[PDB]
């Protein structure tokens, strides 16, 4: 049986090839997670089909309906066999899906327009002239929503009631807001995405400060699935052989435009 | 039933208190892993006894008999219920024991005596005046034994046949060897330990270069043990609540001497 792989259009994990229109199936896409999916499938010995998550989200549980959206939803409701994406390992997710050991490290970080008078979270929290927000329906939003650290609770208290909304529906949208806001909008996003954008034209953004936390992305499967074991062993093998490091260099730095 | 916890004396994860010989049971010890064990046991609701691993090793498989030693061996052969220690998650171990998601990140790194003319692993591999080695029966030695990377493979070739031996039986031994060899010995060890030592008197060593790889420590349990599920969830909870970052600050940096 062909394994259905849910993923998400997010640079440089999964992007449309410049000629995707004249290609078919898996060949339409390129990126870090496309390269990783191929290796995983090869070492686990399965055929697969890449599919982009329909609502374009990572996955959160609606407080009202209790329904999971995003890639997590696709796994929970049986629409996909595996997720290969920059999907953060979290407790609430681990409760309904299985994750491999992490294939990539990251932390919440701050993206500013170059020259913006900000050095850290504490700095953002102490002021009001510069707006700031996070992706919607992602692990970053939940981190702020749940935090008990004073600086972070204060940041959440501002963000949840700021108007107009400080939250964006896509990473691309957050970056665009930073670029067009003349230094008046800072964007809280994962260090991996932050680092990738830092190396792309127009070269007008930068990551500042340390990471606010430390965690990892994992390959996700439906709870109890028979795939989980093999996939986890494959990720460990690829980690030790240095493939993950090679892939990061290929898609983040070898490509650098700044 | 009281959970038997295997662990290892390795600063600052598990250390003997100065109060010591006059204390009993778990009270005799302090450190990051002593504190971790306490929070894990609280969240999973078990009582536990800390026991130092008999042979003082992390764990590797004798290539001849295929018998496991160290903390890995204690789990594999039913002598301990759980290992709470700076135990590296690796492919060969995952085949015989279960690991939680990582509670701490690290990479292999180089420790030198201050002033030693060495900037990197490449530097080390290009010369012979400075000897270098790793801990026995650990994941670092295995990393080099298995590595296909040109620098590391060449390093292994030198290490595996150098005389007198460049390998050491404990981390303490590795560090003291560096400190007393007048710059003629470099020690390859995990960045967490290296960074800890760099901040302790006599303040004569230094971590140089980036990490050679990226990985993590996990809490380990016997294959299929029922404890594993609860333990893993406890670690994710502790991660998200910030307790892990708190612990590291307490034991690495709050304690700094240099
Ligand atoms: N340092 S980490 O927590 O992000 C990590 C952990 C493990 C990996 C790989 C990574 C990293 F590449 F993301 F850096 N490999 C498999 N075993 S692991 O210890 O969980
Ligand atoms: N970056 S990491 O690979 O070492 C890591 C991963 C996860 C953690 C914590 C860490 C770190 F603190 F060691 F940094 N928390 C639980 N989930 S995780 O993604 O596996
Ligand atoms: N990687 C995150 C999405 C990005 C973010 O929340 O900043 C997740 O899995 O939800
Ligand atoms: N953390 C290592 C021990 C120290 C080392 O190998 O450098 C292990 O679990 O084997
Ligand atoms: Zn708690
Ligand atoms: Zn033997």
Swiss-Prot record, chains A, B:
Role noted for this protein: Ionotropic glutamate receptor that functions as a ligand-gated cation channel, gated by L-glutamate and glutamatergic agonists such as alpha-amino-3-hydroxy-5-methyl-4-isoxazolepropionic acid (AMPA), quisqualic acid, and kainic acid. L-glutamate acts as an excitatory neurotransmitter at many synapses in the central nervous system and plays an important role in fast excitatory synaptic transmission.
Domain of life from the UniProt record: Eukaryota
Disulfide bonds listed in the record: 203-258
Species in which this protein is naturally found: Rattus norvegicus (Rat)
UniProt name for this protein: Glutamate receptor 2
Amino acids binding L-glutamate: 86, 88, 93, 139-140, 190
Tissue and organ distribution: Detected in forebrain. Detected in dendrites of neuronal cells. Expressed in the pyramidal cell layers of CA1 and CA3 and in the granule cell layer of the dentate gyrus.
Subcellular location: Cell membrane; Postsynaptic cell membrane; Postsynaptic density membrane
Domain notes: The M4 transmembrane segment mediates tetramerization and is required for cell surface expression.
Site (Crucial to convey clamshell closure to channel opening): 118
Site (described: Interaction with the cone snail toxin Con-ikot-ikot): 61, 145, 237
Similarity comment: Belongs to the glutamate-gated ion channel (TC 1.A.10.1) family. GRIA2 subfamily.
PTM statement from Swiss-Prot or TrEMBL: Palmitoylated. Depalmitoylated upon L-glutamate stimulation.
Note in the entry: The postsynaptic actions of L-glutamate are mediated by a variety of receptors that are named according to their selective agonists. This receptor binds AMPA (quisqualate) > L-glutamate > kainate.
Quaternary organization: Homotetramer or heterotetramer of pore-forming glutamate receptor subunits. Tetramers may be formed by the dimerization of dimers. May interact with MPP4. Forms a ternary complex with GRIP1 and CSPG4. Interacts with ATAD1 in an ATP-dependent manner. ATAD1-catalyzed ATP hydrolysis disrupts binding to ATAD1 and to GRIP1 and leads to AMPAR complex disassembly. Interacts with GRIP2. Interacts with GRIP1. Interacts with NSF via its C-terminus. Interacts with CACNG2, PICK1 and GRIP2. Interacts with GRIA1 and SYNDIG1. Part of a complex containing GRIA2, NSF and NAPA and/or NAPB.
Regulation: induction: Down-regulated in the pyramidal cell layer of CA1 in the hippocampus by global ischemia.
Gene (UniProt): Gria2
Extracellular side: 117-258
Residues modified to Phosphoserine: 147, 181
């Amino acid at each position: 049986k062909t394994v259905v792989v849910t993923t998400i259009l997010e640079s440089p994990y999964v992007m449309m090839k410049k000629n995707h229109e004249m290609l078919e199936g898996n060949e339409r896409y390129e990126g870090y997670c496309v390269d990783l999916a191929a290796e995983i499938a090869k070492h686990c010995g399965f055929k697969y089909k890449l599919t982009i998550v329909g609502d374009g989200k990572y996955g959160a549980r609606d407080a009202d309906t209790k329904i999971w959206n995003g890639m997590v939803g696709e796994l929970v409701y049986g629409k996909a066999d595996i997720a290969i994406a920059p999907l953060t390992i979290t407790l609430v997710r681990e409760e309904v899906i299985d994750f491999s050991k992490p294939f990539m490290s990251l932390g919440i970080s701050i993206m500013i327009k170059k020259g913006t008078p900000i050095e850290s979270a504490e700095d953002l929290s102490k002021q009001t002239e510069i707006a700031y927000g996070t992706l919607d329906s992602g692990s970053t939003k939940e981190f702020f929503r749940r935090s008990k650290i004073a600086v972070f609770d204060k940041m959440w208290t501002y963000m949840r009631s700021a108007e107009p909304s400080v939250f964006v529906r896509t990473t691309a949208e957050g970056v665009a807001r930073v670029r067009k806001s003349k230094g008046k909008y800072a964007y809280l996003l994962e260090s991996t995405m932050n680092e990738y954008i830092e190396q792309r034209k127009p070269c007008d953004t930068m990551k500042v400060g340390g990471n606010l936390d430390s965690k990892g992305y994992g390959i996700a499967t439906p709870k109890g699935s028979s795939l989980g074991n093999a996939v986890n062993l494959a990720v460990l093998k690829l980690s030790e052989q240095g493939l993950l490091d090679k892939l990061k260099n290929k898609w983040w730095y070898d490509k650098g435009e700044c």
